[PDB]
């Protein structure tokens, strides 16, 4: 019978399924539900469908997963909201790419940077009917480095999410894990509608904040930020004072300071 | 000889001037620079001008203050931007109503609540030519209570600022005080343009955030926010789960929950 279903995408889903096959369950005991963006082609992330094809793993529908008693249903960047009443099993888990209760919703590789954070986290939690609302099983908090981009932060969510899965999965399989209700205080949420991918920079902001408005949108597979109709590939912040409210466009880079006058180099594409 | 000027308003300016007359200088050694808004009347805050009237303290201008060699200039919610160059004295100080380097700029009783903070602070710093950018002498960090309004947070800035001013004034007079470069990391700023007093609430937010979007604007002397064209006087965030995305108007209050399902009681204004 199917003991475990991985729903989702990218190296966190593929590498977690690989860990299951080596340590826990046989191919005939697992199933996948790939994301709508999965066409079975490895690119800048591995395709869960391509892995399932190579490893003789069955694809199932959400409708089928509902009917499988005792299934461990694990979302690793699954693209769909499930209704937990529809499942016969109550063994429903998600890895969320933020330090819950902060930064529920989407674009979590943008929202912490854009909102001036110096740390983020990955959080293993029970699925309930809300978005990212379910009881916490485990959390790992890690730094946002001062010149990290959304892409760097994303790759960190991928590696820390994969680590936290491997840590907890035996205890999930043995039903010997605790869960804790999320706090109401410090709970925060961002929907697709809350992020403009073509963000217009506000320069009436600190250097840190102008930096953050650039680097939060550096994720080349999706987009790069533009200054004066010119793509930016990298932003570097230093504590060097060059004066307040500077803007100097050179051939290959902009030099920028905000209200507090610290040096930003925005590298052109 | 004027040794010390207090430029600004409200109980921080008045009670700081009081403590100066009480422990450090005589009336003839001190002058005030009031805000454009000061019409010598006590209300929800005391009037600096009214205090200067009662205690025979002279009003000076900025132009006067610039020429006063050796003067200690203290901005306590002063309304005027100041160029350091213009001053004979380099003993220019500001109490800023945030935990610098965060929440430089304006409406610091609103911005931390609206941006989901559970702490704020008061920072005593040297004035430089930037907005709240100058080197830090001392800082007191205090909690934003879960149901604090912007008024509550402003009242805490006044009390903790008055305390920080008192704890620090001696070493400012002796000129035996340290200052420190503000970090560039975690530096943030809001200008007046960045706050829409009348911003519509986004209900596609957590209960904490809907609660914050109401209470950040509860400050009755300036405004109350509204839901369905009724003014709200208090918001209360509970830990009670009532279901995701609830909204119910009752006679005296709105029952609201966000994307995480916690009950908020928003109390209506009621003549
Ligand atoms: C779609 C998109 C993504 N990105 C970046 C920032 C995003 O955080 C990151 C990941 O994109 P994404 O859509 O895979 O993920 P996120 O939007 O981070 O996560 C949501 O969607 C996932 C598929 C899951 O359903 C998850 N539970 C959701 O929170 O890629 C862009 O910069 N521009 C874009 O237009
Ligand atoms: C003007 C105004 C103020 N308020 C609240 C929030 C503010 O933080 C608080 C105090 O307002 P305020 O006019 O004193 O100014 P703030 O914007 O707090 O402070 C600026 O102006 C002061 C006079 C100083 O120059 C200070 N350094 C500045 O940062 O009252 C409202 O809720 N609505 C309003 O319309
Ligand atoms: N019930 C449930 N809770 C979850 O936390 C959860 C699941 N299911 N399933 C897997 C994963 C799904 N994550 C997401 C998160 C957001 C959207 C999404 O469509 N967001 C819309 C808002 C839609 C709405 O308002 O209902 C958007 O515009 O952001 C989709 C899937 N997940 C945990 O990761
Ligand atoms: N040089 C200096 N630094 C300071 O930090 C400082 C002073 N002077 N003077 C006293 C006080 C004045 N504070 C302020 C702060 C903001 C505005 C203001 O109207 N700001 C506008 C935009 C100004 C700009 O863009 O340059 C706004 O809309 O926010 C006025 C007075 N102050 C420390 O408090």
Looking at the complex, does the CB of residue A182 fall below 8 Å from at least one CB of chain B? yes
Minimal CA separation from A60 to chain B, in Å: 29
CA–CA separation, B131 and B196 (whole Å): 20
Which of B129, B184, B208 shows the shortest C-beta gap to A185? B208
How many C-beta neighbours within 10 Å does residue B128 have?
Answer: 18
Which of B44, B107, B128 to mutate for ligand 2's pocket (most ligand atoms within 8 Å of CB)? B107
The token duo for B208 is: 């904490």
- Assess contact for B31 and B59: CB atoms under 8 A: yes
Do the bridges between strand A4-8 and strand A72-76 make them parallel or antiparallel, or are there none, so unpaired? parallel
The token duo for B270 is: 């009621």
CA–CA separation, B88 and A259 (whole Å): 25
Q: How was this structure determined?
A: X-ray
List the one residue out of B49, B92, B46, B89 whose CA is nearest residue B69. B89
Domain housing A33:
1-269
Degrees to nearest 5, angle at CA A136 with A134 and A140: 135
CA–CA separation, B247 and B172 (whole Å): 53
Q: Report the separation in Å between the CA atom of B220 and the middle of ligand 2, taken as the mean of its atom positions.
A: 13
Looking at ligand 2, which residue's alpha carbon is closest to its atom 35? B222
- Assess contact for B97 and B157: CB atoms under 8 A: yes
B133 chain-A contacts, CB cut-off 8 A? 244, 259-261
The token duo for A54 is: 């190579």
B118 chain-A contacts, CB cut-off 8 A? 185-186
The token duo for B31 is: 């002058």
What are the φ and ψ backbone dihedral angles of A30, each rounded to 5 degrees?
-135, 160
Q: Check CB contact under 8 Å for B130 and A186.
A: no
Q: In 3-state terms, chain B is what percent helix, strand and coil (to 5)? A: 25, 25, 45
Looking at the complex, does the CB of residue A40 fall below 8 Å from at least one CB of chain B? no
HSE of B247, CA atoms in CB hemisphere, 13 A: 12
Looking at the complex, does the CB of residue A116 fall below 8 Å from at least one CB of chain B? yes
Q: Report the separation in Å between the CA atom of A39 and the middle of ligand 1, taken as the mean of its atom positions.
A: 17
Q: Report the separation in Å between the CA atom of B77 and the middle of ligand 4, taken as the mean of its atom positions.
A: 10
CB proximity list for B72: less than 8 A, separation 6 or greater: B3, B4, B5, B89, B91, B93, B172, B173
CA–CA separation, A96 and A12 (whole Å): 11
Minimal CA separation from B165 to chain A, in Å: 24
Secondary structure string (H, E, C) spanning B140-158: EEEECCCCCCHHHHHHHHH
The token duo for A139 is: 């959390």
Looking at the complex, does the CB of residue B245 fall below 8 Å from at least one CB of chain A? no
Q: In 3-state terms, chain A is what percent helix, strand and coil (to 5)? A: 25, 25, 45
Which of A118, A133, A259 shows the shortest C-beta gap to B189? A259
CA–CA separation, B200 and B93 (whole Å): 37
3-class SS at B84?
helix
- Assess contact for B94 and B68: CB atoms under 8 A: no
CA–CA separation, B209 and B112 (whole Å): 12
Number of H helices, E strands in chain B: 6, 14
The token duo for A140 is: 């790992």
Looking at the complex, does the CB of residue B186 fall below 8 Å from at least one CB of chain A? yes
CA–CA separation, A255 and B27 (whole Å): 50
Looking at ligand 2, which residue's alpha carbon is closest to its atom 25? B79
CA–CA separation, A58 and A41 (whole Å): 17
Looking at ligand 4, which residue's alpha carbon is closest to its atom 22? B191
- Nearest C-alpha in B relative to A258: B189
Q: How far is CA A12 from the centre of its chain?
A: 10
Helix ranges (H only) for B199-262 are 207-215
Looking at the complex, does the CB of residue A61 fall below 8 Å from at least one CB of chain B? no
Helix ranges (H only) for chain A are 10-23, 48-54, 62-67, 111-114, 150-173, 207-215
- Assess contact for B165 and B80: CB atoms under 8 A: no
B116 chain-A contacts, CB cut-off 8 A? 102, 186, 188
- Atom number of ligand 2 nearest to Cα B217: 32
CA–CA separation, B2 and B132 (whole Å): 26
How many C-beta neighbours within 10 Å does residue A143 have?
Answer: 11
CA dihedral A31, A34, A40, A43 (to 10 degrees): -120
Question: How far is the CA of B154 from the CAs of A111, B54, B116, B135, B206, in angstroms?
Answer: 28, 26, 16, 23, 24
- Assess contact for A191 and A106: CB atoms under 8 A: yes
- Assess contact for B189 and B239: CB atoms under 8 A: no
DSSP designation for B61: -
- Assess contact for B234 and B149: CB atoms under 8 A: yes
Q: Check CB contact under 8 Å for B208 and A186.
A: yes
Find out whether the beta carbon of A127 lies less than 6 Å from any atom of ligand 1. Answer: no
CA–CA separation, B13 and B158 (whole Å): 9
Show the beta-strand stretches assigned E in B111-243.
Answer: 119-126, 136-143, 189-190, 226-227, 230-241
> Which residue is it, tokens 């461990």?
A72
The token duo for A53 is: 């094809």
The helix (H) or strand (E) run that includes residue B62 is: helix B62-67
Question: How far is the CA of A188 from the CAs of A88, A172, B44, B244, B250, in angstroms?
Answer: 30, 27, 34, 14, 26
Q: Check CB contact under 8 Å for B116 and A188.
A: yes
- Assess contact for B188 and B108: CB atoms under 8 A: no
- ω into residue A101 within 30 of 0, thus cis? yes
Question: How far is the CA of A161 from the CAs of A60, A80, A203, in angstroms?
Answer: 23, 19, 34
Minimal CA separation from A26 to chain B, in Å: 37
CA–CA separation, B108 and B188 (whole Å): 11
- Assess contact for B29 and B4: CB atoms under 8 A: yes
The token duo for A41 is: 């082609």
For helices A150-173 and A10-23, give the axis angle rounded to 10 degrees: 30
Q: Check CB contact under 8 Å for B260 and A209.
A: no
Burial class (CB in 10 A: 0-12, 13-18, 19+), B110: buried
Which of A185, A204, A208 shows the shortest C-beta gap to B184? A208
CA–CA separation, B46 and B54 (whole Å): 12
- Count of domains observed in chain B: 1
Show the beta-strand stretches assigned E in chain B.
Answer: 4-8, 30-34, 58-59, 72-76, 92-96, 104-105, 119-126, 136-143, 189-190, 226-227, 230-241, 247-249, 253-256, 262-268
Looking at ligand 3, which residue's alpha carbon is closest to its atom 22? A191
List A121's β-bridge partners, or say none.
A141
Burial class (CB in 10 A: 0-12, 13-18, 19+), B56: exposed
Secondary structure string (H, E, C) spanning A9-55: CHHHHHHHHHHHHHHCCCHHHEEEEECCCCCCCCCCCCCHHHHHHHC
> Which residue is it, tokens 């109709």?
A229
- Atom number of ligand 2 nearest to Cα B78: 25
How many C-beta neighbours within 10 Å does residue A246 have?
Answer: 17
Q: Check CB contact under 8 Å for A185 and B131.
A: no
A136 chain-B contacts, CB cut-off 8 A? none
List B31's β-bridge partners, or say none.
B5, B58
Looking at the complex, does the CB of residue B135 fall below 8 Å from at least one CB of chain A? no
CA–CA separation, A155 and A37 (whole Å): 18
CA–CA separation, A214 and A227 (whole Å): 9
User: Could you report how far apart the first and last alpha carbons of chain B are, in Å?
Assistant: 53
- Assess contact for A6 and A57: CB atoms under 8 A: no
CA–CA separation, B251 and B102 (whole Å): 40
């Amino acid at each position: 019978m199917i003991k475990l279903c991985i729903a989702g995408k990218n190296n966190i889903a593929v590498n977690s399924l690989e860990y299951i096959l080596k340590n826990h369950f046989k191919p005939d005991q697992v199933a996948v539900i790939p994301n709508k963006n999965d066409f079975g082609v490895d690119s800048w992330q591995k395709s869960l469908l391509h892995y399932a094809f190579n490893n003789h793993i069955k694809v199932i529908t959400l409708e089928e997963a509902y009917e499988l008693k005792q299934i461990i249903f694990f979302s690793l960047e699954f693209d769909r909201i499930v209704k937990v009443e529809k499942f016969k099993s109550d063994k429903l888990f998600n890895m969320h790419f933020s330090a819950l209760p902060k930064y529920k919703g989407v674009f979590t590789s943008i929202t912490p940077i854009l909102n001036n954070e110096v740390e983020s986290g990955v959080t293993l939690h029970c699925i309930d009917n809300g978005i990212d609302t379910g009881n916490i099983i485990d959390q790992y908090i890690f730094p946002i480095n001062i010149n990290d981009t959304a892409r760097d932060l994303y790759f960190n969510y991928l590696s820390y999410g994969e680590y936290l899965f491997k840590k907890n999965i035996q205890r999930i399989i043995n039903n010997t894990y605790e869960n804790f209700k999320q706090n109401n205080i410090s709970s925060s949420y961002f929907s697709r509608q809350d992020i403009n991918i073509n963000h217009k920079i506000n320069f009436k902001k600190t250097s840190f904040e102008i930096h953050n408005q650039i680097r939060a949108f550096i994720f080349k597979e999706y987009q790069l930020p533009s200054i004066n109709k010119t793509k930016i590939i990298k932003s570097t912040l230093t504590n060097e004072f060059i004066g307040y409210n500077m803007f100097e466009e050179f051939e290959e880079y902009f030099m920028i300071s905000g209200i507090d006058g610290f040096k930003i180099i925005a590298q052109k594409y």
